[PDB]
Amino acid sequence: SWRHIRAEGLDSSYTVLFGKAEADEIFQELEKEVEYFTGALARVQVFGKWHSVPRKQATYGDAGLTYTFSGLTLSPKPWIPVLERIRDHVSGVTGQTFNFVLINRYKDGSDHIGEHRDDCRELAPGSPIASVSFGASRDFVFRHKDSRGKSPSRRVAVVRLPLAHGSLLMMNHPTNTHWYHSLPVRKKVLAPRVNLTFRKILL
Template sequence: MDVQLTNLQRLPRKKIKQERDEKMTEEHSEDDEDTAFAEFSNPVPWQKIEAEGLDCDYALLFSKEEADRLFKQLEGEVVYATGEESKVQVYGKVYNIPRKQATYGDAGLTYTYSGVTRLACPWTPTLEYIRDAVTKTTGQTFNFVLVNRYKDGQDHIGEHRDDEKELDPLCPIASVSLGAARDFVFKHRDSRGNQSCRQIEPVKLELAHGSLLLMNPPTNTFWYHSLPVRKKVLLPRINLTFRRILLDSKRESKPKPGVS
């Protein structure tokens, strides 16, 4: 299922959350709408993307001019991993990552995925600026970002879920895209591979230059996502996935979605 990201409805993040509440009536007074808008300094038009167990919101966060500037600044600021830090472990085997990768965030934070633990580098000025723009738009706070740079359409990332134990299960993952537009594909866990037990159509969308995709709970419980190879794409892309990592003292006290 291809998602057409057009005719976006102008709704701030707060109102989208409210509409999920079954107790909310269909009608809103103009005063309520004005109050909701006032709580955000940078409301943007949002596109809702939904399927069984999939809940995402998509918007153009930055204009082309600003996105161009941010991309150029990140090219000069971000230091990507090299050597052993540029490898991942999959089913006991070590592979080179088919893209460049870096981790930034609050002091002392670490993030473990694919058998590798990464220490967060201090925020750069541009990463802080983008993080703060995401916070103003969504009302969510983030203390860590994973940076992926794809040199062209040959660089890619395979099917995976962002469901590591360090992540706050109640916080969405905010994905900011800069550079070449790329296809982004969701696939339900029950419809993957030879052992698939259900026929559920994948959800595919194109992530544009300057866009923001929010993957809300419980999306990463039920859906894998990937950025497949696209040989016709010749330009680079930088993707920033902002996350909220729990401190050790909080991990045991916060349940995962669906667990009481």
């Protein structure tokens, strides 16, 4: 069964792919195998200022591709067994295909990601995004674009969702046209979390 997350312009689906034992093993292999970007490849530019990202990132996928957000371009690394196994399984469950994965690792509840839409030029038009989570459960927040700021034109409610160990969140079109998402700071969370967002990228 899928929990359907629906609101005006919001269309997402949530389910648990893996039980505890399997999700533990996958997490441990991710921790062991994934090579994260450092230094110059972990700095972004937002509002005219450069910052080191408050988390760790890695990109895997087919050769040739490119992934640019916030002034930072990330070349994908060749697929490794554990990412292919997760990719293929998501594909078998959803029917959707993927040639790329972005990995965000939050070492604890102080690591986080800011509010944004996934609306890249390099993202295939109307292609779903598969977000698979491992480790600590973290709250994932959807805010509507017209409901943000000083004076909002719309009073659409915020949508909050705990992403569990071994879960899958599907973000279908047009979720990313109208809704920003983020993983806010959760100061009580002491354990790491690894998130995989599988995507379809144009060459």
